[PDB]
């Protein structure tokens, strides 16, 4: 389907609290969160608008792939345009630049 663009170069994930009453002011490390996503979900194919459930240190979160950047092996530079269209998909790798963005509620610290 993709032809060349088979891996995920950068992945943008909107993080939100599932339960409004379970908000916690703990400082969350991005590196640890990325590691959590990779360790639990590796070499998995992802689309924009796909939802996911994340259990980090007992805390359950809604994750939302807002956009995806699909890059092929061997691409030194990420010249590919990040696609907001759902059609683009790619396969997760341990090196994807994972950017976590506050949910619409804006309660995750």
């Amino acid at each position: 389907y993709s032809g060349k663009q088979s891996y995920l170069g950068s992945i943008d994930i909107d993080i939100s609290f599932r339960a409004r009453g379970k908000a916690v002011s703990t400082v969350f490390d991005q590196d640890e969160l990325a590691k959590q996503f990779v360790r639990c979900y590796e070499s998995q194919i992802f689309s924009p608008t796909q939802y996911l459930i994340m259990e980090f240190q007992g805390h359950f979160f809604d994750l939302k792939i807002r956009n995806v950047q699909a890059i092929d092996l061997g691409d030194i530079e990420p010249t590919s345009a990040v696609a907001t269209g759902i059609e683009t998909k790619g396969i997760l790798t341990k090196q994807t630049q994972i950017n976590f963005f506050k949910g619409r509620d804006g309660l995750v610290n």
């Binding site: 950068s10 950047q69 990420p78 990040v82 630049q97």
Partner: protein
């Protein structure tokens, strides 16, 4: 001040010339000049709009302002008191020619 001691400044800019150019600048205008010059620098990286998401460590790791940014910046900030000399410089838009000796004598006098 901070820009220099934090090694964010190109070595090419020489402040004396800047002081020379800014004839009627007030004490509150120089600051806007600095802001504009930096704004060009940062914009080269981000490219708000079309070419989005290029933000990466490499780009931001070597930011330095250049002299031509200030030269460009002069076109945005404009004096407030130096508004009547502009008339004078535009009065000789037609150029000057020395088709006769006489003119030289007059200017010399």
């Amino acid at each position: 001040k901070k820009m220099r001691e934090n090694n964010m400044m190109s070595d090419d800019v020489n402040l004396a010339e800047l002081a020379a150019l800014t004839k009627n600048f007030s004490g509150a205008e120089i600051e806007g000049l600095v802001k504009s010059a930096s704004s060009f620098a940062i914009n080269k990286t981000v490219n708000i709009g079309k070419g989005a998401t290029k933000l990466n460590t490499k780009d931001i790791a070597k930011l330095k302002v250049t002299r031509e940014d200030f030269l460009n910046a002069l076109n945005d900030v404009t004096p407030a008191f130096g508004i009547s000399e502009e008339d004078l410089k535009t009065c000789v838009e037609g150029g000057m020619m020395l088709y006769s000796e006489r003119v030289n004598s007059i200017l010399k006098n």
